Amino acid sequence: EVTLTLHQFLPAQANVPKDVLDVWADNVEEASDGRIEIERYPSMQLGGTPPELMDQAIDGIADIVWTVVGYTPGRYPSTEVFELPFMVSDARAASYAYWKMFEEHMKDGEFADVKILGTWVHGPGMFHTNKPVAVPSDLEGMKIRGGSRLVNDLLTRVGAEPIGMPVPAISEALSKGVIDGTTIPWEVTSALKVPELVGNHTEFDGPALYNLTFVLAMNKDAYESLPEDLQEVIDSQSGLAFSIFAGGTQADADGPARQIAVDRGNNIVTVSQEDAKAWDALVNPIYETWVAEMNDKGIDGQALIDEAKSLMEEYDPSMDTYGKAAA
């Protein structure tokens, strides 16, 4: 008889909570034959700010959290291989690569203090602004919200003034004119009333401008102290197939979100793969600086980039098998 608490930073009817986390939690409960119940607390209901979620899991405030890796910068630098500009073409492929590389490089190193249940990226990160944006110079003198240190670097290099804040604060920040626009993928715009608060959006054909890494993470003591058969339940509903499903589900939610912006008459600029080269010219120096920072810490940054590309190429849609579990 086991009760676990799950804490996260978006509303219960948001896309990841409802179609990813509730499916995972329901899977663990069904698979445990009712021996595990998971209480789900949305919108930081148990207190704190979203950046604090990783430490809430480590300190046992919550048993399980979904959080943005980038909200605790300087801690988990290996994840940042997926946050390099124009790196990712397919969120399922990247989430597959992210799980393999997590297990190879990160599990017993930068993530040793926590049990990692899932690793994924969102759909293409893109702009949502009070004024139309077609080329990098349009961002000059705009305050743009970012959620990671690599996204703040990207924003600086295209001539934006980056404002770092957790994603739920965007709505108030836009409404009060603290920011002129934000980075996010499409899927989460709906829950944040972004199409209501701004009339312009800039998306990119081909590779994503950026995407942020997430984890689903669990207090080590809470996991280790389960009986071994209940440990095997958590593991059976977690890891590689789960990670591909989390990234795929979240990426797929871009579509219905974009359609809301279209149907209201918001302006959407679609940057062609040709016109993206002007953007790439300003942001691709991050590859060289990031590799140098990793090399300074004795990490082969370029080998991490090469292995990410190789794993994303090796992903095949037949690996996307995650669904509702047997008991």
Ligand X SMILES: O=C(O)CCc1ccccc1
Binding site for ligand X (CB under 6 A): 10, 16, 68, 122, 147, 167, 183-185, 188, 212
Strand partners, 119: 215
We find the least distance from the C-beta atom of residue 197 to ligand X, in angstroms, to be 16
Strand partners, 68: 214
List, as own/partner pairs, every contact residues 286-291 make where C-beta atoms lie below 8 angstroms and the sequence separation is at least 24, other chains included.
Answer: 286/84, 286/85, 286/150, 286/153, 286/154, 286/157, 287/84, 287/85, 289/153, 290/80, 290/84, 290/150
Token couple for 138: 């349009």
Cβ proximity to ligand X: between 16 and 304 the closer is: 16
We find the least distance from the C-beta atom of residue 102 to ligand X, in angstroms, to be 19
We find the least distance from the C-beta atom of residue 212 to ligand X, in angstroms, to be 5
The angle subtended at Cα 62 by Cα 240 and Cα 50, nearest 5°, is 80
Cβ proximity to ligand X: between 6 and 222 the closer is: 6
Cβ proximity to ligand X: between 81 and 170 the closer is: 170
Closest Cα partner for 271 from 263, 280, 262?
Answer: 280
Cβ proximity to ligand X: between 173 and 222 the closer is: 173
Strand partners, 65: 7, 217
We find the least distance from the C-beta atom of residue 188 to ligand X, in angstroms, to be 4
- Please tell me what DSSP assigns to residue 80: G
Q: Which residue is nearest to ligand X (CB)?
A: 147
We find the least distance from the C-beta atom of residue 140 to ligand X, in angstroms, to be 22
We find the least distance from the C-beta atom of residue 4 to ligand X, in angstroms, to be 22
Cβ proximity to ligand X: between 167 and 308 the closer is: 167
Cα–Cα dist 88/93, whole Å:
8
Closest Cα partner for 23 from 228, 220, 250?
Answer: 250
Cβ proximity to ligand X: between 16 and 294 the closer is: 16
